[PDB]
Structure formats: structure tokens, C-alpha cells
Design a protein around this ligand. Structure first.
Ligand SMILES: Cc1nc(N[C@H](C)c2cc(N)cc(C(F)(F)F)c2)c2ccccc2n1
Length: 445
């Protein structure tokens, strides 16, 4: 059964399995290994391993550069034949071609095909990486393998090239259409604020590739960064709109309008937006505004209290709602980032055996299983009309200005103490900052 393989100095993937290079947990599950050993099992001669191909291509950037992965799979493909025994039947050589060279070479090409189909951004970010891939597959000879080169070439071409019902009418309130200079929390219609923020957040959620969350929660993660900045900017914008409205009556109208935006986020199944509002309402500057929340109606308090209970017990009620909901939806994105940090903290980058270092692949596998849950909600377009001016208003939100986040939250907290001083101190009287009406048009379209 064991075949005659080429020398380890002429082919690096021929080294036997040992505790210095691979550790396993009916395909065996890899716990840890060197990059050479991971690449070997990624293109194993004995069997196909699509779950390992999927997980490896999502996580390898946390232990290997794309340029190194390409160099190593080319090295894996270029198998030298062992030296003959002075020779001819050539039984072991014919069998080495059939049972080792052919399956490994086919498996390298299957890894290339999965790499260009599901992770083309690696090639978009580095033109020379694509140039090397196209050059490598171009040197592949043989009819059976030219079919794999044709499919890889068609996928590269395809990647280079790249309503269910009638959407409802766009809603307007004080700010007339196109009057961008007046666009603000109380001047735009609360329904349209919630519809446009949902389209913005649905596009941002859909643009996040699973690999962007591996070993990182800039080039590596552009869409994750844009998603996190949006959530920070929108949450802090809600807080700023609340505490910078010093007049009690106007601040009640601001808080009440944000709760109405949350109701429409609930109707739209935008759980990301629901929990952005909850996060703003639970922040230290807002949560302590007892005089403000005293004037909020009971029905609006119930809405906000129930939206908070979605996060209790590690998001228990949220997960039940998400599963029981019909698309379209925008799932809460923060939970993936929390679970990835919980998985990665205290989890070692490497295992050490006999002075040698092995990459901890279990750590990468557990992160991939979390990120794999993101994609099932990324092909759910909303049946809502985009409003370019409102979208641009929410894209350019910059509440912090030049401040750093922590310092800005301390400013928000001190603004909260100015507008509602602590119990002994009197409640001051502040002038009105808005001359337009505060009455909401409601959440009914
Ligand atoms: C049911 C619940 N809700 C919460 N926070 C929500 C988001 C809320 C915030 C603010 N600021 C005002 C209201 C209200 F009710 F007055 F409108 C509600 C909690 C926050 C911390 C601990 C337990 C919590 N339990």
C-alpha cells in the first residue's frame, strides 16, 4: 500500500507525519500543523476534503500571505518522480503517477478554482498575484487537467466582469425633497430614516466577506471596517442628537423619534439597527436621563424595554426572532465580532512540540464556523427605493468630528450632566434650538 515517493530535499511535501509537524483531534480533523503539512492535507492524495478546503481558504491569511500560498501550491503541484532502482515493468512508478501525482495535481487545481470563485478579492487587491495564477495554470498540460484550467479561466473572466413587489412611496416630513441642508433627525420622516438606514446597513452587511473577520476583530478588512464605523457613527449620532438638545421638551421629541425609528427597524427586521438604538439608549449619557424618559409614553417605553431584552442571556430572544423571521432582514452584526473575540481570546496562535512551531488550525476552524453563519443572510435584497440624498446624509455622519471615541463619550457624559444635573442640583431651563414643529408624523405609511 505505501508508495515510493521522491526525496524530501527534492520535494518538501514528502516528509512523514510526526508530532513536530501535525496533530489531529471519517476524515481526521487537523488540530495543528506546519504550513507545509496543512498544504499537504489541503491537497491529499487519499481523499477529497471540501470542508478543509472551505475553512483553509477563509482562514489562511491569519498564518500565510496569499503570495506564499500560491508559491506553496505550485511547489505542491510540481512533483518529481522518484529515481529508478538502476532500471522495465516500472510498477511502483506507474502507480505513483496514478495514485499520488494525478489526485494531488487535480486537488491543487480544485483549490485554485475554489480560491478564485470564493475569494477573488485576494486577486483584486494584488494584480501580480492574479498574474502569477494565470501564468501557472497556463503551463498545465494534459487533457483531463486542461478542463480544470478552462473552468478556472472562465471563473477569472466572470469575476473580472463583476424587486419582488412594488416598493412603497418615499416618505417626507419637514425637509422637502432635495433640501439636503436641512436634513436632520427630526426634519426627515422617521419612516424614511429607518428605510434608508436599513438599505445602507443591508449593503454594508452583504459586502463583508467571511475572511475579513479572521485574526482581526485596512486592505485585509475594508468592508468590516466600513460596517464597524457605520455602527459607531450612527450610535454616537443618536447619543449626540439626544444630549446636545438641552431643552427638555425638544430632547423628549428627539428620544421619542429615535424609538419610532426603532419600531420601523423592527417592521423591516433590521436587527442591526434595533440594537444600534438600544446601544445608544443604554450608553451612560442617555441612560441616566430620568427627566427625559419620564415624559416618554408607556407604549414607547415597552418597545425599547423589549428591544433591550433581545440582548439578554447572550442574545437568546434575538436568535429566536432571527430564526423565526421571514427575509428580508439585516442580522445583528456585533454578535459575530463578540463570539469571534470570545473564541480567539486565550486561544494560542501556535502549538509547540520538540522545539518546533505548529499553527493552531483549531482556532481558525472555530472562527470559520462563526463567520460561516454570516453568509446565509447576505442574499436578501429589500423592496425599498433608495433616496440618494438621504443615503449620502447617513454615509457622511461624523458626530465625533476630530475627537477620539473615548474622549467624545466623556464629552457626551459631561453634556448629559449639564442638561440633567445630579439629584441635589437644580434642573436648568434651556432655550429652544429648533423652530420647526416637534410633532412626529408617525410610523404609519
Ligand atoms: C428592560 C431593560 N431595558 C434596558 N434598557 C433600555 C434600552 C432602555 C433604556 C433607556 N435609557 C430607557 C428605557 C425606558 F424604558 F425608559 F424607555 C429603556 C436595560 C438596560 C440595562 C439593564 C437592564 C435593562 N432592562
Amino acid at each position: 500500500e505505501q508508495m515510493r515517493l521522491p526525496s524530501a530535499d527534492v520535494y518538501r511535501f514528502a516528509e512523514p507525519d510526526s508530532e513536530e509537524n501535525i496533530i489531529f483531534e471519517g476524515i481526521p480533523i487537523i488540530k495543528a500543523g506546519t504550513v507545509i503539512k496543512l498544504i499537504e492535507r489541503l491537497t491529499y492524495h487519499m481523499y477529497a476534503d471540501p470542508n478543509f478546503v472551505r475553512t483553509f481558504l477563509t482562514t489562511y491569511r491569519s498564518f500565510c500571505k496569499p503570495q506564499e500560498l500560491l508559491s506553496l501550491i505550485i511547489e505542491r503541484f510540481e512533483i518529481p518522480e522518484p529515481e529508478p532502482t538502476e532500471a522495465p515493468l516500472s510498477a511502483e512508478l506507474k502507480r505513483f503517477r496514478k495514485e499520488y501525482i494525478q489526485p494531488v495535481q487535480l486537488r491543487v487545481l480544485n483549490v485554485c478554482r475554489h480560491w478564485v470563485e470564493h475569494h477573488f478579492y485576494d486577486f483584486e487587491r494584488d494584480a501580480y498575484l492574479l498574474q502569477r495564477m494565470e501564468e501557472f495554470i497556463g503551463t498545465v498540460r494534459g487533457k483531463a487537467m486542461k478542463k480544470w484550467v478552462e473552468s478556472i479561466t472562465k471563473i477569472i473572466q466572470r469575476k473580472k466582469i463583476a424587486f419582488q413587489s412594488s416598493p412603497p412611496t418615499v416618505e417626507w416630513h419637514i425637509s422637502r425633497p432635495g433640501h439636503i441642508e436641512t436634513f436632520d433627525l427630526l426634519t426627515l420622516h422617521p419612516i424614511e430614516i429607518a428605510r434608508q438606514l436599513t438599505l445602507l446597513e443591508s449593503d454594508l452587511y452583504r459586502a463583508v466577506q467571511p475572511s475579513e473577520l479572521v485574526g482581526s476583530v485596512e486592505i485585509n478588512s475594508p468592508n468590516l471596517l466600513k460596517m464597524i464605523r457605520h455602527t459607531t457613527n450612527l450610535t454616537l449620532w443618536f447619543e449626540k442628537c439626544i444630549v446636545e438638545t438641552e431643552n427638555l421638551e425638544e430632547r423628549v421629541a428627539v428620544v421619542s423619534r429615535i424609538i419610532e425609528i426603532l419600531q420601523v427597524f423592527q417592521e423591516l427586521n433590521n436587527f442591526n439597527g434595533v440594537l444600534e438604538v438600544v446601544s445608544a439608549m443604554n450608553s451612560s449619557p442617555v441612560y441616566r436621563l430620568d427627566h427625559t424618559f419620564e415624559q416618554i409614553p408607556s407604549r414607547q417605553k415597552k418597545i425599547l424595554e423589549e428591544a433591550h431584552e433581545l440582548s439578554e442571556d447572550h442574545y437568546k430572544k434575538y436568535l429566536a426572532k432571527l430564526r423565526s423571521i421571514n427575509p428580508p432582514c439585516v442580522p445583528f452584526f456585533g454578535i459575530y465580532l463578540t463570539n469571534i473575540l470570545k473564541t480567539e481570546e486565550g486561544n494560542p496562535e501556535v502549538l509547540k512540540r520538540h522545539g518546533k512551531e505548529l499553527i493552531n488550525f483549531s482556532k481558525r476552524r472555530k472562527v470559520a464556523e462563526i463567520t460561516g453563519e454570516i453568509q446565509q443572510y447576505q442574499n436578501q435584497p429589500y423592496c425599498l427605493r433608495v433616496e440618494s440624498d438621504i443615503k449620502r446624509f447617513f454615509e457622511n455622519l461624523n458626530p465625533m468630528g476630530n475627537s477620539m471615541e473615548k474622549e467624545f463619550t466623556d464629552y457626551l457624559f459631561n453634556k448629559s450632566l449639564e442638561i440633567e444635573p445630579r439629584n441635589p442640583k437644580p434642573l436648568p431651563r434651556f432655550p429652544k434650538k429648533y423652530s420647526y414643529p416637534l410633532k412626529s408624523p408617525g410610523v404609519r405609511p
